[PDB]
Motif scaffolding. Structure first.
Motif, PDB file in Angstrom:
ATOM      1  N   UNK B   3       0.848  -1.185   0.000  1.00 37.26           N
ATOM      2  CA  UNK B   3       0.000   0.000   0.000  1.00 37.26           C
ATOM      3  C   UNK B   3       0.885   1.236   0.000  1.00 37.26           C
ATOM      4  N   UNK B   4       0.639   2.131  -0.931  1.00 41.21           N
ATOM      5  CA  UNK B   4       1.350   3.367  -1.201  1.00 41.21           C
ATOM      6  C   UNK B   4       0.495   4.549  -0.772  1.00 41.21           C
ATOM      7  N   UNK B   5       1.088   5.648  -0.305  1.00 44.23           N
ATOM      8  CA  UNK B   5       0.293   6.686   0.366  1.00 44.23           C
ATOM      9  C   UNK B   5      -0.726   7.397  -0.506  1.00 44.23           C
ATOM     10  N   UNK B   7      -3.204   5.475  -2.067  1.00 41.74           N
ATOM     11  CA  UNK B   7      -4.391   4.635  -2.089  1.00 41.74           C
ATOM     12  C   UNK B   7      -5.535   5.218  -1.286  1.00 41.74           C
ATOM     13  N   UNK B   8      -5.356   6.374  -0.678  1.00 45.04           N
ATOM     14  CA  UNK B   8      -6.328   6.903   0.266  1.00 45.04           C
ATOM     15  C   UNK B   8      -7.573   7.308  -0.493  1.00 45.04           C
TER      16      UNK B   8
ATOM     17  N   UNK G 736       6.549   0.163   4.702  1.00 42.89           N
ATOM     18  CA  UNK G 736       7.133  -1.129   4.330  1.00 42.89           C
ATOM     19  C   UNK G 736       8.478  -1.007   3.683  1.00 42.89           C
ATOM     20  N   UNK G 759      -4.968   4.386   8.876  1.00 45.47           N
ATOM     21  CA  UNK G 759      -4.411   4.148   7.558  1.00 45.47           C
ATOM     22  C   UNK G 759      -2.909   3.944   7.624  1.00 45.47           C
ATOM     23  N   UNK G 762      -2.015   0.656   8.400  1.00 41.11           N
ATOM     24  CA  UNK G 762      -2.195  -0.313   7.328  1.00 41.11           C
ATOM     25  C   UNK G 762      -0.880  -0.751   6.696  1.00 41.11           C
ATOM     26  N   UNK G 763       0.124   0.130   6.638  1.00 38.92           N
ATOM     27  CA  UNK G 763       1.388  -0.206   5.979  1.00 38.92           C
ATOM     28  C   UNK G 763       2.045  -1.410   6.626  1.00 38.92           C
ATOM     29  N   UNK G 766      -0.033  -4.713   6.439  1.00 39.50           N
ATOM     30  CA  UNK G 766       0.015  -5.462   5.200  1.00 39.50           C
ATOM     31  C   UNK G 766       1.407  -5.976   4.899  1.00 39.50           C
TER      32      UNK G 766
END
Ligand SMILES: C[C@H](CCC(=O)NCCC[N+](C)(C)C[C@H](O)CS(=O)(=O)O)[C@H]1CC[C@H]2[C@@H]3[C@H](O)C[C@@H]4C[C@H](O)CC[C@]4(C)[C@H]3C[C@H](O)[C@]12C
Ligand SMILES: C[C@H](CCC(=O)NCCC[N+](C)(C)C[C@H](O)CS(=O)(=O)O)[C@H]1CC[C@H]2[C@@H]3[C@H](O)C[C@@H]4C[C@H](O)CC[C@]4(C)[C@H]3C[C@H](O)[C@]12C
Ligand SMILES: [Mg+2]
Ligand SMILES: [Zn+2]
Ligand SMILES: [Zn+2]
Ligand SMILES: [Zn+2]
Lengths: 49, 50, 79, 72, 248, 94, 1347
Positions: B3-5, B7-8, G736, G759, G762-763, G766
């Motif tokens: 997940x990359x910042x 995706x919000x 990550x 959020x 979440x990093x 996952x």
């Protein structure tokens, strides 16, 4: 799913690792009695015999 | 797989089938659409001066 | 009807020769070779073989002595 | 255990090793230097107060971090 | 009804389900209060004041209902659809702050702590240390047991390699793969392994001699040699490779 | 000789890439059948890639096979195929 | 059919005809109208036998009596139809054709058999170029290839007495025309004359090859097929699928292609087409056959009507789906099943539950036998109809078949040999396999839907093995260490930890009880709580007498809880075990002490009693969790305000230009982690001692009963970290990349988490998922790679009869003793007898199994090292003797004879490997003795300076810490010449510094005290104008090579020591006069003009990460030489320099007198940690850095490298906190260093520089030197596992895990008569494994053979 009266306590280890211990009042009422419907086929092929 | 910042609002961070292929099966977010050219695009409220 | 074999492995060591000896003895009791020497607890022949190993009244030497005895009892019944 | 708990332990390892790497980078211990270790310029004592044992100035420090951004 | 395991929450940070249990407990509290008010059947004014208390409830919201607009023959319908329990909502990241739940438990008559003394049902004596209760919403995933269960004593067999291949619920043996063989080599177990992959599985004479012996009550196994290795000889020999078996 | 430098880099670095091999290769052949042969040879050589992506982690990590007496013949086949001439491949083209 | 070794060799043509049953001729398969097979195509009737059992093709003969007669009308031998599965027919390839394996294997079999490079072979084969075949003697070499025009001319050159072909005919002519004895004589000639080590190296190599190829039964031309066999008809079927659609295999397609091309070539030959036609046809047939065999190595496969390349004969053997790996190891299994496992606490631990319906489906044959025995069904069909009605009596008969019949229960991945345990059954309603609870830790199986499979043991030997070896209550000791694997896990320990605690004022305070019994009678009736501190009269039975049990009543001062726990503890244990809190660690060492004292039966029955009482009182606690249970610290808001103000400080100071961006980021992350630890501590101290209650007085505080705290204290679940995240703030999510984000989560789970914070969580969440997805899919790679190398190893001797083991001591890494001696000499058997420090005695005979009694003695007498026998020095030939492996096992006695220890070793090393981080992972100037205890110096070379202090003049003096006991309590490694204070073997006081030195800079302190001058110190040449020029310090420091002239490079920088006149006193003991020479950067300070004191810093010379993952273990066993190899001595003698700086400066070391000349080339970019005037011992640290294990093995010896590997991989485990006993690593090492090398063959017959394995050469020279002759010197090797497994006496084994093609072809040319007697071998060929029970059987066959 359906909402049912849960209570958090070990109770003789019929829920040891991650288990659940459903009381027969849940199974009598048919409130998880779910229904499954199948499609059984019986073809009639044309053999050389 | 990650997940990359950005995706919000365009891909659910917490919905993806764990197991063989995590992150490859992202779920499109609630309010999000597809851009004209094809990118994902989320809503925002335009803020004027204050 | 027997949780372990540990007495057996004490008596007849090596823990594998136990398996082999007990299996031979069990084939004797199951196929019509003989009958047990320990009072059966309506157990299958496997437990009875492990038990007879446990009493020091079956082992490799005794089984071969009985092999000899039945081989020699036959030649005097063939004539 | 579960497929979540293994992931918890792995994430704890990852964040722990990160945080320890960035606590190790900060000095907070050493002998006062009084001047740059690269250019010889003086380190103003306010900056030395902020970090006990600053081997560099702010200029040389920025320069070194900036070359190191390209990771060479 | 259900009796889960408390040792699963502190190890897995999902305290969400515990907040949900308290909130559901309070929600059925409102439901049972409506049930009594309706089953001791009072008058629509009682239900109006009470349900209208249940909907206003304190902190600011985007919900205000104003039950002085409903007719009597609607608020009675509404109460009947609420008697099972007053369905509470909680938008995802704008949830019910705990003080709101404590107050919605006071609106009932449950214990604000969220926990009750539970008397055991066998020995009839109080479980020390009040337990949690409440209504948790529990699904039923379709990993049912009577789709996973399976057992195969002697089914069909494959065609090129004579292995168990049955269909119905993979109506064939379990894949007694390689690491299981390392297990059974790790023990001294040699006969179990042999009948695990010579008699029970492939050797197309050994298996029927095994079955005849089993029915005859004579547990032996005259093993022979697998069928897979025989196919391996025929293949390795189809190449230009004389593979043989010395005989001595 | 430079393809032998590809060989030594594949020995040291522990892999290669399509870009690396396509860099070092002997010019003027580019039929893409000789290329597939030579890539299979470099695979049969010490290098075991042939790559696209550099790595690679705990997922099948730290893999290797010695395969002695194959490296000396594979590198020989490389140095001979480059130096003499470019050999034809397949039989329709024959 | 108990045949023999299997044998492999080339496929001689007439042999291929003897395999035949008639030439295949036509490409037809079946008849498109009647689906009988056309005659004769790939299929047939007359070739490969009849279709229907005992029935002709046309149908003339259809009775069993007519078996054997071949019908006169269609010649079909009426026989069984399984004869359709064993007949091979052949093809008569018109022109010959080259077998692709003996062409493109990699090292060409034909290439290095004809002495010919590969490209020319491809020329002659694909018709690129002509080639001579016995061109006579006019002009042309035999191998001399040609081209078109050259052959055209040469036909005019020598039209007569000339012989040139091209195609397979050419290669076959060459191979046939070759004569191998001629080449052996020629090669021995050029081994004689041509004296060039490279040259005669490859010469003798090729002669090795040819002599091998001669001593096989082979012939060189059998590599070129004339006759090519077709696989039978039923291994490549043409099944009639439903609908007319047939689903055939692919070999039918390939053979159809080859038969087409052969027939077409024959047809071309009859016409005699022009040569382009026949050439292209022969090439097409070559490609067709080469695609038949391998369908690869040819460059481009020939895919079928799909786009998917069609599989071929070299591909039905290979791969993880070939017959080896996919149908000779992983085979389906009748008499099995599976289901969802479940909980089932009502079981003793030796009986798994089981459904009635899985039982009545697994045991149908047993049921049928019993039912025809009790006359409930006269015939078997009747019994089937009965048990298919599920009638009343078949349940009774099933309970009579399931009395003592152990089912094997397996879980999905079976890592370690406890993964497959047997149980008895207990018939059950339902469909869940009600497993026991305790065993779940062993299987590694929670109950979230995991599915275990049940097998069934058919025979009688297998039942006795599923009872006496695999029963559940005979494997409670984990195979990788003696500690029980029946540790009570989560509800049971919470039950006990609630039961045996003490609240300060409960009912029944202080009242005495008459025993445990009325403790229960008080608790149940309610007159007193379960826990309230109470005098009782326990009666513990200590058994100090020889097997006795001496009762001893008393009044222990306990609770009611401990006492009611005491009614379950068996006899021999002492009451101080259940008087404490009984956490998880203590409740497991309860079972451990039980097993160490009372044997196995009481430990089993006691583990069951513990689980029963644990579940019972855990349910009685009502140990629930509720939302008032997670207490936030009321001092949290302050801490977060304070740290969020410190970040304000760093923000203000960053926008004043005082700190870079990196510095403010690091400082921010530092103050947030600090706030985090402070908040976590504040919550934990609001949480642990929080409860405050009051005994008949004011108040008092105790450990709390906050449910989450008991769940975090017992060891049931969680720890202080998860309790942090539930109450205190939760740290700093790490993105990550690896870089940690700087925006911490100032909230927690009892509060909410607004959108950003969740959020950011979440990093890391996952990333944890995306790693434990790759770990579960690649979990057993390490065990796989180890059991490949360490498999055929079986404990096959009672006593090897040696006296050579490895010396065990307690590891001490410069501090508190990590691993004591009772954890290392626990099981292993002594090598040489042990003497109490006065010798006083003979404490223990050399062959005493060191069970815990002997560790008792050794720890009562304070023994420090116990030279214990070890697996890596056992003197057994193909095996490992009984003792030297020691004792460890799931049992507690000596290892049996035969029990396959290679596998359980690899699994002891590989199952905890699941419990290790899969990514690699890096953790990151005075000596200070801990406590009282004398000082101990080893290799200390000190000088009594005129100053008084002590200085070491030896590079390797270890600074130990001995007490008056004599034990080694601490050890420290002094650098060179550290300023030392106290005495050598004398006494010091606790916590007191005793050694100081120079942190970064190396002293050169003198030897004795004498006058000083200089030699060869000319500025500009050898020295430079250095000085701390504000002080007057004239420093003419030695110039380096880049600053010394090209004659200056020939100069000698020096420090001469003059006596009182101008001469040089001899160095004490030697005759080198008094002076020290020095290298470049030997920074001088003082000059000529002072008398030195011992400890004079004549110069100033300037100047650990532990990877802890699993990949560190993978690379340890791979034995890869690291990046910076620790340069190491080579000959025990004086040191010197060599040819100065030819890029790499050359060291030179010299012994007293012997073979001196060793010089070594070193990258002079790296420090040399050696003096210029010393005597470097062999195996001494010239440089630093990780030292290559090969160098350990070659310089020091075996035991050095084995202690290296075991301590290195033990570091990798006990970093993570995983226990694994060192027998297992030592046995994997004994499989590592198996091969060997030779120095002087001498009175043996091995090639000198040849590599041969240790067992063979050792038996050779043992039996020879047993004679009057002389031995053979051998230098031991050390291979990585991935290469040490790569050599195998068998080829059936090496055809499994190596790549199959190279194995088959190498064995094939070599004609390698592979025996059996491995484990891969026999598990493949399906006879008794020679490991466990099968070992006696194989001894039987050994006796049969050789008599
Ligand atoms: C997450 C992992 C457990 C998973 C099973 C545990 C087990 C050992 C732990 C490391 C070591 O202790 C060394 C070091 C100690 C420092 O104090 C803090 C950092 C270090 C790097 C630790 C990080 C982490 O906490 C480790 C990896
Ligand atoms: C391509 C596909 C793979 C899964 C995607 C495989 C899996 C099942 C295969 C079919 C079955 O055999 C049934 C049927 C038999 C007829 O007689 C011939 C046609 C059919 C339609 C087959 C074609 C094809 O081979 C199928 C679709
Ligand atoms: Mg699971
Ligand atoms: Zn500076
Ligand atoms: Zn006929
Ligand atoms: Zn030994």
């Amino acid at each position: 799913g359906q909402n049912m009266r849960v209570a958090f306590m070990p109770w003789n280890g019929y829920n040891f690792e991650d288990s659940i211990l459903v009381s027969e009042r849940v199974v009598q009422e048919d409130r998880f009695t779910t229904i499954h419907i199948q499609e059984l086929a019986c073809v009639s092929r044309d053999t050389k015999l | 797989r990650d997940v990359h910042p950005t995706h919000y609002g365009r891909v659910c961070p917490i919905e993806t089938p764990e197991g063989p292929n995590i992150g490859l099966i992202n779920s499109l977010s609630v309010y999000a659409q597809t851009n004209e050219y094809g990118f994902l695009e989320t809503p925002y409220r335009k803020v004027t001066d204050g | 009807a027997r949780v372990t074999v540990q007495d057996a492995v004490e008596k007849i060591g090596n823990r594998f020769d136990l398996v082999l000896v007990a299996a031979r003895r069990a084939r004797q009791m199951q196929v019509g070779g003989k009958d047990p020497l320990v009072p059966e607890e309506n157990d299958k022949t496997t437990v009875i073989a492990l038990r007879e190993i446990e009493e020091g009244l079956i082992n490799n030497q005794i089984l071969d002595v009985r092999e000899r005895q039945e081989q020699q009892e036959q030649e005097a019944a063939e004539l | 255990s579960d497929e979540a708990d293994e992931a918890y332990s792995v994430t704890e390892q990852l964040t722990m090793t990160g945080i320890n790497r960035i606590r190790q980078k900060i000095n907070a211990h050493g002998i006062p230097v009084y001047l740059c270790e690269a250019c010889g310029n003086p380190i103003p004592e306010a900056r030395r107060k902020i970090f006990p044992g600053v081997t560099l100035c702010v200029e040389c420090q920025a320069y070194q971090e900036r070359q190191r951004k390209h990771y060479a | 009804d259900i009796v889960l395991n408390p040792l699963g929450v502190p190890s897995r940070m999902n305290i969400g389900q515990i907040l949900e249990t308290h909130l559901g407990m309070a929600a059925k509290g409102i439901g049972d209060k409506i049930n009594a008010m309706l089953k001791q059947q009072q008058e629509v004014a009682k239900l109006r004041e009470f349900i209208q208390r249940a909907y206003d409830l304190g902190a600011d919201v985007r919900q205000k209902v104003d039950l002085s607009t409903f007719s009597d023959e609607e608020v009675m319908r509404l109460a009947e659809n609420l008697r099972k329990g007053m369905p509470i909502a909680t938008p995802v990241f704008d949830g019910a702050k705990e003080a709101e739940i404590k107050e919605l438990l006071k609106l009932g008559d449950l214990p604000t702590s969220g926990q009750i003394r539970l008397y055991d049902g066998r020995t009839g004596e109080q479980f020390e240390r009040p337990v949690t209760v409440g209504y948790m919403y529990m699904l039923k995933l379709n990993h049912l047991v009577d789709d996973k269960m399976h057992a195969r004593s002697t089914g069909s067999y494959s065609l090129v390699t004579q292995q168990p291949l049955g269909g119905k619920a993979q109506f064939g043996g379990q894949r007694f793969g390689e690491m299981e063989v390392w297990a059974l080599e790790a023990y001294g177990a040699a006969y179990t392994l042999q009948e695990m992959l010579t008699v029970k599985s492939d050797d197309v004479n050994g298996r029927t001699k095994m079955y005849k012996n089993i029915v005859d009550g004579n547990h032996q196994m005259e093993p022979g040699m697998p069928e897979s290795f025989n196919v391996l000889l025929k293949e390795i020999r189809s190449l230009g490779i004389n593979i043989e078996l010395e005989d001595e | 000789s430079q393809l032998k430098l590809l060989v030594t880099r594949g020995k040291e670095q522990g892999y290669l890439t399509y870009a690396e091999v396509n860099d070092h290769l002997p010019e003027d052949i580019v039929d893409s059948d000789q290329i597939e042969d030579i890539i299979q040879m470099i695979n049969d050589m010490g290098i075991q890639v042939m790559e696209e992506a550099p790595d690679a982690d705990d997922l099948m990590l730290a893999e290797n096979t010695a395969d002695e007496d194959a490296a000396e013949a594979a590198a020989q086949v490389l140095s001979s195929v480059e130096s003499e001439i470019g050999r034809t491949t397949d039989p329709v083209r024959m | 059919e108990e045949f023999d070794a299997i044998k492999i060799a080339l496929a001689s043509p007439d042999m291929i005809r003897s395999w035949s049953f008639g030439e295949v001729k036509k490409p037809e398969t079946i008849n498109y109208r009647t689906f009988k097979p056309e005659r004769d195509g790939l299929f047939c009737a007359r070739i490969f036998g009849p279709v229907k059992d005992y029935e002709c093709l046309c149908g003339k003969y259809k009775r069993l009596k007519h078996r054997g007669v071949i019908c006169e009308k269609c010649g079909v031998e009426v026989t069984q139809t399984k004869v359709r599965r064993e007949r091979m027919g052949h093809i008569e390839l018109a022109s010959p054709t080259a077998h692709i394996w003996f062409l493109k294997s990699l090292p060409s079999r034909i290439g290095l058999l004809l002495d010919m490079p590969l490209r020319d072979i491809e020329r002659v084969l694909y018709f690129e170029s002509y080639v001579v075949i016995e061109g006579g003697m006019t002009n042309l070499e035999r191998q001399q290839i040609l081209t078109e025009e050259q052959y055209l001319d040469a036909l005019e050159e020598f039209g007569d007495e000339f012989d040139a072909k091209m195609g397979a005919e050419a290669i076959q002519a060459l191979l046939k025309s070759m004569d191998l004895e001629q080449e052996c004589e020629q090669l021995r000639e050029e081994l004689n004359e041509t004296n060039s080590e490279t040259k005669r190296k490859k010469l003798t190599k090729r002669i090795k090859l040819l002599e091998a190829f001669v001593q096989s039964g082979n012939k060189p031309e059998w590599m070129i097929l004339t006759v090519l066999p077709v696989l039978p008809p039923d291994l490549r079927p043409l099944v009639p699928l439903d609908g007319g659609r047939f689903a055939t295999s692919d070999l039918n397609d390939l053979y159809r292609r080859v038969i087409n091309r052969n027939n077409r070539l024959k047809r071309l030959l009859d016409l005699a087409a022009p040569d382009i036609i026949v050439r292209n046809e022969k090439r097409m047939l070559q490609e067709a056959v080469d695609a038949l065999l391998d369908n690869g190595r040819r460059g481009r496969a020939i895919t079928g009507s799909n786009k998917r390349p069609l599989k071929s004969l070299a591909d039905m053997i290979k791969g993880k789906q070939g017959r080896f790996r996919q149908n000779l190891l992983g085979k389906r299994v009748d008499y099995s099943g599976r289901s969802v496992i479940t909980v089932g606490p009502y079981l003793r631990l030796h009986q798994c539950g089981l459904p009635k319906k899985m039982a009545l489906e697994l045991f149908k044959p047993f049921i049928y036998g019993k039912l025809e025995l009790r006359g409930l069904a006269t015939t078997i069909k009747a019994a089937k109809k009965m048990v298919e009605r599920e009638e009343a009596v078949v349940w009774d008969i099933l309970d009579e078949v399931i009395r003592e019949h152990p089912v094997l229960l397996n879980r999905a991945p079976t890592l370690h040999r406890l993964g497959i345990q047997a149980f008895e059954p207990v018939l059950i309603e339902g469909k869940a396999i009600q497993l026991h609870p305790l065993v779940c830790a062993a299987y590694n199986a929670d109950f979230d839907g995991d599915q275990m499979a049940v097998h069934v043991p058919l025979t009688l030997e297998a039942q006795l093995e599923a009872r006496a070896l695999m029963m559940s209550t005979n494997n409670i000791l984990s195979p990788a260490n003696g500690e029980p694997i029946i540790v009570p896990s989560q509800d049971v320990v919470l039950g006990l930890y609630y039961m045996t605690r003490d609240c300060v004022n409960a009912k029944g305070e202080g009242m005495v009880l008459t025993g445990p019994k009325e403790a229960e009678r008080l608790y149940r009736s309610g007159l007193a709580s379960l826990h309230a501190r109470v005098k009782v009269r326990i009666t513990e039975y200590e058994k100090d007498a020889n097997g006795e049990l001496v009762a001893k009543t008393s009044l222990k001062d306990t609770t009611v809880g401990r006492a009611i726990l005491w009614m379950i503890v068996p006899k021999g244990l002492p009451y101080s075990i259940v008087n404490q809190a009984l956490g998880k660690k203590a409740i497991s060492k309860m079972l451990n002490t039980c097993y160490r004292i009372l044997g196995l039966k009481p430990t089993v029955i006691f583990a069951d009693q513990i689980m029963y009482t644990g579940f019972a009182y855990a349910a009685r606690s009502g140990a629930s969790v509720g939302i008032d249970d997670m207490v936030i610290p009321e001092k949290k808001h302050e801490i977060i305000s304070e740290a969020e103000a410190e970040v304000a400080e760093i923000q203000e100071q960053f926008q004043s230009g005082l700190v870079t961006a990196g510095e403010r980021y690091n400082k921010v992350i530092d103050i947030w982690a600090a706030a985090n630890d402070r908040v976590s501590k504040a919550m934990m101290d609001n949480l642990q001692t929080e409860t405050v209650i009051n005994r008949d007085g004011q108040e008092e505080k105790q450990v709390s009963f906050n449910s989450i705290y008991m769940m975090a204290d017992s060891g049931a679940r969680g720890s202080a970290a998860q309790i942090r995240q539930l109450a205190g703030m939760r740290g700093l999510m790490a993105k990550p990349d690896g870089s940690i984000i700087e925006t911490p989560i100032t909230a927690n789970f009892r509060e909410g988490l607004n959108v950003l914070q969740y959020f950011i969580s979440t990093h890391g969440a996952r990333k944890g998922l995306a790693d434990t997805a790759l770990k579960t899919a690649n979990s057993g790679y390490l065990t796989r790679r180890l059991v490949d190398v360490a498999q055929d190893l079986v404990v096959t001797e009672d006593d090897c009869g040696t006296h050579e083991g490895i010396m065990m001591t307690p590891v001490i890494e410069g501090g508190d003793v990590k691993e004591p001696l009772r954890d290392r000499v626990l099981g292993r058997v002594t090598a040489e007898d042990v003497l109490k420090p006065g010798t006083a005695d003979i404490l223990v005979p050399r062959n005493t199994l060191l069970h815990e009694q002997w560790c008792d003695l050794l720890e009562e007498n304070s023994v420090d090292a116990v030279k214990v026998r070890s697996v890596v020095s056992c003197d057994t030939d193909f095996g490992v003797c009984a003792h030297c492996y020691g004792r460890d096992l799931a049992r507690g006695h000596i290892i049996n004879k035969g029990e396959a220890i290679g596998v359980i070793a690899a699994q002891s090393i590989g199952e905890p490997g699941t419990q290790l981080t899969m990514r690699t992972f890096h953790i990151g100037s005075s000596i200070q003795v801990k406590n009282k205890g004398s000082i101990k110096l080893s290799n200390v070379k000190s000088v009594v300076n005129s100053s008084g202090k002590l200085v070491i003049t030896s590079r390797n003096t270890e600074l130990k810490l001995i007490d008056e006991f004599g034990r080694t309590k601490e050890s420290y490694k002094v650098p060179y010449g550290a300023v030392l204070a106290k005495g050598d073997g004398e006494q010091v006081a606790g916590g007191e510094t005793v050694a100081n030195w120079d942190p970064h800079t190396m002293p050169v302190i003198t030897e004795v005290s004498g006058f000083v001058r200089f030699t060869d110190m000319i500025d500009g040449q050898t020295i430079t104008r250095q000085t701390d020029e504000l002080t007057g310090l004239s420093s003419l420091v030695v110039l380096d090579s880049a600053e010394r002239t090209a004659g200056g490079k020939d100069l000698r920088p020096a420090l001469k020591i003059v006596d009182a006149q101008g001469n040089d006193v001899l160095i004490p003991g030697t005759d080198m006069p008094a002076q020290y020479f020095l290298p470049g950067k030997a920074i001088v300070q003082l000059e000529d003009g002072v008398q030195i004191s011992s400890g004079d810093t004549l110069a100033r010379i300037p100047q650990k990460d532990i990877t802890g993952g699993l990949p560190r273990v993978a690379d340890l066993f791979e034995a890869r030489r690291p990046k910076e190899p620790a340069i190491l001595a080579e000959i025990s003698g004086i040191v010197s320099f060599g040819k100065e700086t030819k890029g790499k400066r050359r060291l030179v070391i010299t012994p007293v007198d012997g073979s001196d000349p060793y010089e070594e080339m070193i990258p002079k970019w790296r420090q040399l940690n050696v003096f210029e005037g010393e005597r470097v011992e062999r195996g001494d640290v010239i440089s630093d850095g990780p030292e290559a294990p090969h160098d350990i093995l070659r310089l020091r010896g075996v035991h050095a490298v084995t202690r290296y590997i075991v301590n290195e991989v033990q570091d990798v485990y006990r970093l993570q906190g995983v226990k694994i006993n060192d027998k297992h690593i030592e046995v994997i090492v004994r499989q590592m260093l198996r091969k060997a090398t030779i120095v002087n063959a001498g009175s043996s017959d091995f090639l000198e520089g040849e590599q041969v394995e240790y067992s063979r050469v050792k038996i050779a020279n043992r039996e020879l030197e047993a004679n009057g002759k002389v031995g053979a010197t051998y230098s031991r090797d050390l291979l990585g596992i991935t290469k040490a497994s790569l050599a195998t006496e068998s080829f059936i084994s090496a055809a499994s895990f190596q790549e199959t093609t190279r194995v088959l072809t190498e064995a094939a040319v070599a004609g390698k008569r592979d025996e059996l007697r491995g484990l891969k071998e026999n598990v493949i060929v399906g006879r008794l494994i020679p490991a466990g029970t099968g070992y006696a059987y194989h001894q039987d066959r050994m006796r049969r053979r050789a008599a």
